[PDB]
Scaffold this active site. Structure first.
Site, short mmCIF file in Angstrom:
data_model
loop_
_atom_site.label_atom_id
_atom_site.label_comp_id
_atom_site.label_asym_id
_atom_site.label_seq_id
_atom_site.Cartn_x
_atom_site.Cartn_y
_atom_site.Cartn_z
N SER A 94 0.82 -1.22 0.00
CA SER A 94 0.00 0.00 0.00
C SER A 94 0.86 1.27 0.00
O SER A 94 0.34 2.39 -0.21
CB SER A 94 -0.92 0.04 1.22
N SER A 127 -6.28 3.06 2.69
CA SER A 127 -5.62 2.13 1.76
C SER A 127 -6.60 1.41 0.83
O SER A 127 -6.57 0.17 0.80
CB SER A 127 -4.76 1.10 2.50
N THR A 147 1.31 3.49 5.80
CA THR A 147 1.57 2.10 6.11
C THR A 147 1.48 1.17 4.89
O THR A 147 0.96 1.51 3.82
CB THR A 147 0.54 1.57 7.11
N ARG A 157 4.64 -1.91 13.09
CA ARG A 157 5.09 -1.05 11.98
C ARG A 157 5.19 0.41 12.47
O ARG A 157 6.00 1.18 11.95
CB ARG A 157 4.04 -0.97 10.86
C1 LIG Z 1 -1.71 -2.01 1.69
O1 LIG Z 1 -0.61 -2.28 2.15
C2 LIG Z 1 -2.82 -3.06 1.89
C3 LIG Z 1 -3.79 -2.55 2.98
N1 LIG Z 1 -3.09 -2.24 4.26
C4 LIG Z 1 -3.82 -2.63 5.27
C5 LIG Z 1 -3.41 -2.56 6.72
O2 LIG Z 1 -2.47 -1.81 7.01
O3 LIG Z 1 -4.09 -3.20 7.56
C6 LIG Z 1 -5.16 -3.13 4.79
S1 LIG Z 1 -6.54 -1.85 4.67
C7 LIG Z 1 -6.79 -1.22 6.34
C8 LIG Z 1 -8.19 -1.53 6.89
N2 LIG Z 1 -8.29 -0.55 7.99
C9 LIG Z 1 -7.18 0.43 7.92
C10 LIG Z 1 -7.49 1.88 8.31
O4 LIG Z 1 -6.58 2.67 8.61
N3 LIG Z 1 -8.77 2.27 8.35
C11 LIG Z 1 -9.93 1.38 8.19
C12 LIG Z 1 -9.07 3.68 8.64
C13 LIG Z 1 -6.74 0.29 6.47
C14 LIG Z 1 -4.85 -3.59 3.37
C15 LIG Z 1 -4.39 -5.05 3.36
C16 LIG Z 1 -3.41 -3.40 0.51
C17 LIG Z 1 -4.59 -2.54 0.10
O5 LIG Z 1 -2.42 -3.21 -0.49
#
Ligand SMILES: *C(=O)[C@@H]([C@@H]1N=C(C(=O)O)[C@@H](S[C@@H]2CN[C@H](C(=O)N(C)C)C2)[C@@H]1C)[C@@H](C)O
Ligand SMILES: *C(=O)[C@@H]([C@@H]1N=C(C(=O)O)[C@@H](S[C@@H]2CN[C@H](C(=O)N(C)C)C2)[C@@H]1C)[C@@H](C)O
Lengths: 243, 242
Positions: free
Chosen positions: B47, B95, B186, B227
């Site tokens: 991401s 993300s 992240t 992280r």
């Molecule tokens: C990117 O690296 C990937 C995404 N990263 C994720 C993670 O850090 O858990 C998840 S989406 C995550 C769901 N809730 C988080 C948030 O901050 N809110 C809901 C506000 C985001 C996902 C695997 C992928 C998309 O490449």
């Protein structure tokens, strides 16, 4: 396009506050206020003038870019918070008036005057000295005009480059959550009677945007926090601030 | 002239994980890490790729401007938090991969490749399908290279308009105080083995700037908070936080 929200003076009564809140969704064509008369009344902008001053400073080249550092020459300043080197964002967020006084002198009267005309900024009166007009001079602006000016800034529709509007926008972020983002600026004008307190800005939440301006008379210094807490409580009750 | 600070490893072993932190003051010419080798090893960006993807989307005009709304078409998505219309900052902050996969599709391989070259972004390998390469494809970037890339963004020196660099920077703000501002992103890459967790960004503290990039091997979601917490502990030891 402006409506009186009687549902709001309840938040001013507990602290005996004489003030006004203006809140607009999407545009300044959909506003509400607790007080129609006070919404349009013009008050000394005090530190809120750092928003147009910063834009003007960049547009004229007086301010080089968002990375410029305003160095402290070691001479005593009115507040300890100002006695250090500051970025543009730092100078705005700590309200470092000596930095902005130097910026206003370098902009100068003729250009300052023109830019406040282009921005439709209040009564556009810069009487009282190039480095004093927003502090104890004749410049005055209403809460409605603040929200019109900030809507322009949000949309990059001021008469300034998009780049310079973007620089000043990042300098005004004060709260960042994954749910919402707040841009804002306080003021406290002690150079007028009654003293005036301001909090102006905008909130982006989900896919909506709300512009706001609050001002109040400051009866004494210990009342200063109400300039953020009353409008914050109002916006929280409407769902605008909060996750 | 990156320096190794072996004491930083205590923060990784306290939490039973393997990884690297790279931290630079002022510029990418003054950096330290806990692990010199891993600092240069390239990992799937996951991401964290939303940073260059957003910039490329604006440069190419795929993303109209800063106020673009990415409408949700009603079709089910992997996370409920993505089942909504989103702004660009919204899509970045949660993300929302479906938004970015549509951006990547519209950008297309030739233009995506061209910009990753201009950005010197990792091994620049966008094999794996135009909407998958940063998720389960061949793209890989090191912690050092993330710091170089983010330093260029902070300075508006990427090969993109200043306006578009500023738009994405505001979308990346995650903490704001009057003299302290954090831009960060992240990542969790589960489309590779081992899985990778990232946090990259930079801190503007008074008149100084610190760039950082962290990655670690992730067994599963439970270790994801590390992280942020391991970098936070190291940056505290460096006097950056308090
Ligand atoms: C990117 O690296 C990937 C995404 N990263 C994720 C993670 O850090 O858990 C998840 S989406 C995550 C769901 N809730 C988080 C948030 O901050 N809110 C809901 C506000 C985001 C996902 C695997 C992928 C998309 O490449
Ligand atoms: C602006 O309206 C005036 C300034 N605003 C002030 C206020 O809101 O209290 C003070 S400066 C004050 C120093 N400590 C505070 C700080 O560092 N933060 C809130 C971040 C701000 C001052 C009267 C004046 C400059 O016009």
């Amino acid at each position: 396009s402006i409506t009186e929200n009687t549902s709001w003076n309840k938040e001013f009564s507990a602290e005996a506050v004489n003030g006004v809140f203006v809140l607009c969704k999407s545009s300044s064509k959909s506003c509400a206020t607790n007080d129609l008369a006070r919404a349009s009344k013009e008050y000394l902008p005090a530190s809120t003038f750092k928003i147009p001053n910063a834009i003007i400073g960049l547009e004229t080249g007086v301010i080089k870019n968002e990375h410029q550092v305003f160095k402290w020459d070691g001479k005593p300043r009115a507040m300890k918070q100002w006695e250090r080197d500051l970025t543009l964002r730092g100078a705005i967020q700590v309200s470092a008036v000596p930095v902005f006084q130097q910026i206003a002198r370098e902009v100068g009267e003729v250009r300052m005057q023109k830019y406040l005309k282009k921005f439709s900024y209040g009564n556009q009166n810069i009487s009282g000295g190039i480095d004093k007009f927003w502090l104890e001079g004749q410049l005055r602006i209403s809460a409605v005009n603040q929200v019109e000016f900030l809507e322009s800034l949000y949309l990059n529709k001021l008469s300034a480059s998009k780049e310079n509007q973007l620089i000043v926008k990042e300098a005004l972020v004060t709260e960042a959550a994954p749910e919402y983002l707040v841009h804002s600026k306080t003021g406290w004008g002690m150079g007028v009677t009654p003293q005036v307190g301001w909090w102006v800005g905008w909130v982006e939440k989900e896919t909506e945007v709300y512009f706001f301006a609050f001002n109040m008379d400051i009866d004494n210094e210990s009342k200063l926090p109400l300039r953020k807490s009353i409008p914050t409580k109002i916006m929280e009750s409407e769902g605008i601030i909060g996750g």
